[PDB]
Design a protein around this ligand. Sequence first.
Ligand SMILES: [Mg+2]
Ligand SMILES: [Mg+2]
Lengths: 117, 114, 113, 111
Amino acid sequence: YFKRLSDRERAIFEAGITLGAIYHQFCGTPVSPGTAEEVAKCIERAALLQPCVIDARVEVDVSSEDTDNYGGYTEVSGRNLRVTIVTRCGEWEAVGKLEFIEELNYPLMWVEEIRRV
Amino acid sequence: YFKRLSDRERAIFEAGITLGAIYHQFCGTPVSPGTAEEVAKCIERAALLQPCVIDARVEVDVSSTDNYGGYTEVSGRNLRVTIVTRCGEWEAVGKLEFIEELNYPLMWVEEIRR
Amino acid sequence: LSDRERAIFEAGITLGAIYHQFCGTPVSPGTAEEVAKCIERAALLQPCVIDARVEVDVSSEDTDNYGGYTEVSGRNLRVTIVTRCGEWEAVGKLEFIEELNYPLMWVEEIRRV
Amino acid sequence: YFKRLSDRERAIFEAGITLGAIYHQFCGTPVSPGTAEEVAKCIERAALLQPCVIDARVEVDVNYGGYTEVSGRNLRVTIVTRCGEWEAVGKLEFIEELNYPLMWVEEIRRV
Ligand SMILES: [Mg+2]
Ligand SMILES: [Mg+2]
């Protein structure tokens, strides 16, 4: 109510929120090699508006072999989307990552680092 | 799949498809007055990839976001879209805009033209 | 738009809206029918839609990964919708077409009631 | 990937992921009074597939088109995540004084 989380905990909470939000808002977005940098930037800028987010790095890894289809384009998906987000509440930073992990066959979300400033 | 569909008909159909897709793909995107043009631009470029789409003009109309998070969301209240589809010799002008009188973001066709 | 043109436009709107509203939804083999039905019901609220049939085609192999689930996508999602505006109907379809490597949307049929 | 992350903090991370995912997957979904229960059920079932999610309760509290959409205004959610011996209860609800749909953790508790 609504302040039970210490801010280390909040930094972890907000990294989780931003990773899930980014993934679900943007997966499905039509994208090409020519687009894919500008889309990545809009995603970062959208992530940087969320509570406690102080850094967002997004890559949408698309190549022309991904656009060999009637449409001539592909979509943002767990397969081509990679995100690092840094969150800071008070003196604590958390580092959240999204990346398709081949061995897991799955776009994993994890906490890379939790860090006192 | 398009053996009997006219180009005129496809222009209309693709404008509908593109407007539904934009709306549902981008509604809920965190936005602020400072993002809002760049968000518009990525929406445009995403639109321009889809079949028959030869033009797209988007605005996200966001003012000074007074709330806890300090931002708003792309929605039917703030999203304005005009797209032009061209299939063969036919163009449709498709539009999306909140129509104050109906209380709803309306999608419509402004013009169909050769 | 005349009623016939409205029938086509609304079918395109509904396919586009459904595809991008629902893709990314987590789904498993026995999810897969309740999700399909949720999609039908949302399609039925759109102007002119009078029939919606949705299949979400997921097998245990699609779910052979760390999470144990998959997501609704261009590859597993099939939709037929029927629009009626006034005296005219349009049948709109969505399906992954292998030869095209693409989830194509198209008009199967335009016909008088 | 989780060698150094405590299960307590994983429970918190996953709650956050699931609330953000729910919110952004489903906002925009056409809904009406007769929709609105069944929609909530599809959301819970979608939420329940996610890592560590063991419980999900959703309400959708419902012009030209004759319908409305799942939004931050009408969507309410409580999830329980369980990782190892720890549980977090995550909430999403519109808070009037904040004029914002807040996501927050209501409690973290031992199993
Ligand atoms: Mg939305
Ligand atoms: Mg999606």
